């Protein structure tokens, strides 16, 4: 065991791809905020955290429209261990040419491409979903 957030994203990818309408997860604050912003922009339905094995657990509902179709298009951690990634205010990448959204853990907290561009600080980007 080396990487928890990559396993977070891998479980999201498999669970959404394998047509499951929910996924369960240990609640470390990192993935908590990742799914929080995910529902904030609406690629998932709704996340709720309750009590579990010694920590807590976050349960995520994936947003499916009129059919079994996922608002999520895909997930991929970029700033992985061994290849951790930093970015600045100017060259803030635009997800899917700007269509999608990203995660950038700013010194001021957590922000996406557009938010950080409106503000202008950088330092650590993460996965992006479109």
């Amino acid at each position: 065991m080396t990487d928890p957030i990559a396993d977070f994203l891998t479980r999201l990818r498999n669970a959404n791809s394998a047509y499951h309408d929910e996924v369960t997860l240990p609640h470390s604050k990192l993935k908590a905020n990742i799914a929080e912003i995910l529902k904030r922009e609406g690629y998932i339905s709704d996340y709720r955290t309750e009590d579990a094995r010694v920590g807590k657990s976050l349960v995520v509902q994936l947003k499916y429209g009129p059919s079994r179709e996922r608002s999520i298009a895909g997930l991929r951690r970029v700033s992985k261990p061994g290849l951790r990634v930093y970015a600045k205010s100017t060259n803030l990448p635009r997800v899917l040419g700007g269509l999608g959204v990203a995660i950038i853990s700013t010194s001021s907290g957590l922000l996406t491409d557009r938010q950080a561009a409106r503000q202008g600080v950088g330092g650590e980007v993460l996965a992006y979903v479109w």
Partner: protein, 198 residues
Amino acid sequence: RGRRDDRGGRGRDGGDKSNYIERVVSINRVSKVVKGGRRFSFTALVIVGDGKGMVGVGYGKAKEVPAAIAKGVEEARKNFFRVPLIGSTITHPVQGEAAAGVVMLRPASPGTGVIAGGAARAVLECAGVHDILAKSLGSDNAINVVHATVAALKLLQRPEEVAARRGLPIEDVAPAGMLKARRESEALAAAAAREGSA
């Protein structure tokens, strides 16, 4: 594809609507080993399209080159396909595959031009593209390259799709960048419609 320019006293030549640009990429001779002999047939890959953009792909396995061409044309008529774009650009860079063939596509500055390989040039210009950038790799072939072209094209959609998926509108979905590009596209379309109205 021999002696196609004919002017006779017969009835007609089968002209119809759908003033579609046609293209054929390649035909390889196909050898069936009958007991002690070789029968030779043809395999045509036909790509039909419109300057509006909508595309069709057909595949005629016929022992005759004109029969193969006709079979490909009618399969493309059966197997059509639609592509969304932005003026003369692509809505977003994409990658497509056919089992060994990889194709990368990217929007370009207006008027840049369709810079694409021989097969890709055909598969693209049959659509409504005028200015995008693209390339391909792998498969050391053309059938898979053509097949992957449509695979990449399939990953194309309007910003409305991500707007509905997010529930949130454009902006994050379609930022000013594309916003102004699609505004130019639709404004040119509206101006053309107004001009054609009179």
